[PDB]
Amino acid sequence: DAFSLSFETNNTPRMTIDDVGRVGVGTTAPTSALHVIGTGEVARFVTSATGGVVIDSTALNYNPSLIYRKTNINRWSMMVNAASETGGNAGSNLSILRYDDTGATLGAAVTIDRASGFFGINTAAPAYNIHVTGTAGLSTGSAWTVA
Amino acid sequence: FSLSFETNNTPRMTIDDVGRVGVGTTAPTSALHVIGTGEVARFVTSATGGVVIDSTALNYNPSLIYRKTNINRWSMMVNAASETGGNAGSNLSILRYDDTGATLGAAVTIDRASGFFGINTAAPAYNIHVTGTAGLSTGSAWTVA
Amino acid sequence: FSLSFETNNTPRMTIDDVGRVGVGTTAPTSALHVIGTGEVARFVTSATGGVVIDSTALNYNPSLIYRKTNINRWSMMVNAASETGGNAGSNLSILRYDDTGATLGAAVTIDRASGFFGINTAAPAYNIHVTGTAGLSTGSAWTVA
A70/B60 CB distance under 8 A: yes
A129/C119 CB distance under 8 A: yes
Interface test with chain A among B44, B109, B129, by most A beta carbons within 10 Å: B44
Chain A residue numbers touching B33 (CB-CB < 8 A) = 43-44, 46
**DSSP summary character for residue B24:** S
- Specify the pairing of strand C62-68 against strand A51-57: parallel
Cβ–Cβ under 8 Å, residues B76 and A78: yes
d(CA A107, CA C73): 21
**How was this structure obtained?**
X-ray
What is the residue-wise DSSP string for A50-83?
Answer: SEEEEEEESSTTS-EEEEEEETTEEEEEEEE---
**DSSP summary character for residue B89:** S
Q: What angle do CA A3, B39, B17 make, to 5 degrees?
A: 35
d(CA B33, CA B35): 7
Gap from C48 CA to chain A (nearest CA, Å): 6
Chain B residue numbers touching A68 (CB-CB < 8 A) = 52-54, 62, 77-78, 92
Chain C neighbours (≥3 Cβ pairs under 8 A) are A, B
CB proximity list for A86: less than 8 A, separation 6 or greater: none
- Specify the pairing of strand C39-45 against strand B49-55: parallel
Nearest Cα residue in chain A from B34? A45
Cβ–Cβ under 8 Å, residues A31 and A22: yes
Closest CA to C116 of B111, B135, A134, A143: B135
Residue type, B93: S
Question: Diameter of chain B by CA atoms?
Answer: 67
Nearest Cα residue in chain B from C51? B64
Chain B residue numbers touching A76 (CB-CB < 8 A) = 78, 90, 92, 110, 112
d(CA B96, CA C37): 33
A68/B53 CB distance under 8 A: yes
Cβ–Cβ under 8 Å, residues C83 and C77: no
What is the residue-wise DSSP string for C43-102?
Answer: EEESSSEEEEEEESSTTS-EEEEEEETTEEEEEEEE------STT-S--EEEEEE-TTS-
C64/A55 CB distance under 8 A: yes
Chain B residue numbers touching A95 (CB-CB < 8 A) = none
d(CA B30, CA A36): 10
**DSSP summary character for residue A86:** -
A127/C135 CB distance under 8 A: yes
Closest CA to A142 of B130, B119, B118, C110: B130
